Ligand binder design. Structure first.
Ligand SMILES: [Cl-]
Ligand SMILES: [Cl-]
Ligand SMILES: [Cl-]
Ligand SMILES: [Cl-]
Ligand SMILES: [Cl-]
Ligand SMILES: [Cl-]
Ligand SMILES: [Cl-]
Ligand code: NA
Ligand code: NA
Length: 125
């Protein structure tokens, strides 16, 4: 399913979360990335890159005092005129994400104000 390089930084003093979509590799196409921010299970924000180096920094406002019920969803999509863009791959980082996102997310919580970059495997989405 391919790989996605993301950097995250929990700027806790301002309650912001910065997210950089850097790049994808080994994609199976006209890729862009959509980024959804969830509070508990409600989407509270969304971003997307242009349409595979992406190099795009986003700043999210966190409405609560911690990242405990926050999750970030990355979708790598193939842009195609005249039909629904197909999800090439998917990545969720959060407090109960599979393993990848999970530990990257934990490290973000453990080292606030640090930028931590990591390669993650994409899943089906
Ligand atoms: Cl490689
Ligand atoms: Cl989209
Ligand atoms: Cl979406
Ligand atoms: Cl949408
Ligand atoms: Cl650039
Ligand atoms: Cl932004
Ligand atoms: Cl890595
Ligand atoms: Na935001
Ligand atoms: Na389309």
């Amino acid at each position: 399913r391919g790989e996605l390089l993301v950097s995250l930084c929990y700027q806790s003093t301002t309650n912001t979360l910065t997210v950089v979509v850097l790049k994808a590799r080994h994609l199976p196409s006209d890729p862009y990335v959509k980024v959804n921010l969830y509070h508990a299970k409600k989407r509270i924000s969304k971003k997307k890159t242009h349409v595979a180096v992406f190099n795009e920094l986003f700043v999210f406002d966190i409405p609560c005092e911690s990242l405990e019920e926050i999750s970030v969803e990355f979708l790598v999509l193939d842009s195609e005129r005249g039909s629904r863009n197909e999800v090439i791959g998917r990545l969720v980082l959060g407090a109960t994400a599979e393993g990848s996102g999970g530990g990257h997310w934990k490290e973000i919580c453990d080292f606030p104000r640090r930028q931590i970059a990591k390669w993650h495997m994409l899943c089906d989405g």
